[PDB]
Structure formats: structure tokens, C-alpha cells
Amino acid sequence: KKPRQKRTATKAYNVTQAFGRRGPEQTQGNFGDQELIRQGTDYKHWPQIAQFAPSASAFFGMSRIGMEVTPSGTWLTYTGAIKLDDKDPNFKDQVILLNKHIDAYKTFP
Amino acid sequence: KKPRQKRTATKAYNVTQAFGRRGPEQTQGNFGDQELIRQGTDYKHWPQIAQFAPSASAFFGMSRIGMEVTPSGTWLTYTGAIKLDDKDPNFKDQVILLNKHIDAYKTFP
Numbered sequence A, B: 001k002k003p004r005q006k007r008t009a010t011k012a013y014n015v016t017q018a019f020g021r022r023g024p025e026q027t028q029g030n031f032g033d034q035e036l037i038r039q040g041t042d043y044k045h046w047p048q049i050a051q052f053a054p055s056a057s058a059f060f061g062m063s064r065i066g067m068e069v070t071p072s073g074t075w076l077t078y079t080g081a082i083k084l085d086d087k088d089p090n091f092k093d094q095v096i097l098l099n100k101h102i103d104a105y106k107t108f109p
């Protein structure tokens, strides 16, 4: 049993199955429209999204890390920010793509 | 030369060189004692730390993602939490190791 953070979503084991329903609560992810949720790393523009995901070294190097204990369990918390390069020729498209998936679930029928 | 989020710290390119000095401010990292800062992914217990880092799929599946536009540019924000396995026989050691590195910088120059 690989832990949740090591899972990879695909068409046969999708974002909802691996990582739960999209939503606004603290423990929920909010990222992905219906196409990305159904397809995971098979999504047509997945590489353009993954360019922004951190390496293990960067995850622990760039982030503010903490530990919290709640009734549900013991949690390693993380927060940070990643600058988009507005000198990148593909900047405008990167922004459009990220905004299409952030909080997409709010307009799901 | 690589974007910050794709860098890999090592003895040749250490945590300070790759990710900046440890400290408390936003986008500043707070994780690592003197030994980890110097060695990065060559640190003896690096695998026991990296087991908690997310895959690219998990990062975008589990996290709360946002986009903050400020005078310095456009920033992709992330926040989330990784649950430790309370039934793992090494749970107690995992807690000790993470706590050893969180805010370690407060105790040395």
C-alpha cells in the first residue's frame, strides 16, 4: 500500500479516486476541471502543469513546513509560492491553463 | 539555471545555494538542521524525509492551489498537509526526524 502522496492519477485510477473530491475545505484539493479529474497524468496538457510541481528536495527546501496533531491524525503541513516567469514565451497560456483548473469544481453541474 | 521548484540540493549545490537561507518569511524555507542544509539529498536520512514529498500528480491533486498577482508578478500559491501513518512501526522515529528539522535554524547562526 503506497501512501496517498506517492499515488499517480490516470484514466484507470483518477484524481477523485486517488486524492478525493475537489472542494473548498482545508483537507480537500481544489485543482482540476472535469477533463483533468477523469484523466490525471493522461490529460493533454499535463506536462504544462507538472512543470510547476516541486522535486522532493524543493518541496522540503522552498516550503514552510510544520507538524499538527488533530483527532484525525498527525499531519505534516506545507505552504509556499512559485513565481511564474513572465519572460517565458508561454506565460500567458500558463496563466490561462492554471486558472481553468483552480476552483473549476464550482461550476460543475 | 533550473527553475527553483525543479532544483535538487546536494553536497555540491546545497540547500542554501538552491533555496536560500532558512528563515520565517513567506517563500523562505524553514526546514533543515546544519547537516541537512550542507548535504541536501546526500543526507543520511534523506529517504526517510522524501517518503513524505508528493508526486507531481499528488501535489496538484492534494493541495489548495491559488494564483496571487502582485507588484512583483504572478505567483502560484500552494498549501496542504500530508498524513503520517500512525500504524507504521517507525512512526515515532518519523515524528522525531521531522521535528529535528522544522525551524532548526532558530538554534544556530
Ligand SMILES: Nc1nc2ccc(O)cc2s1
Pocket: A004, A005, A020, A027, A028, B081, B082, B083, B084
Ligand atoms: N481527507 C484526507 N485524507 C488523507 C489521507 C492521507 C493524506 O496524506 C492526506 C489526506 S486528506
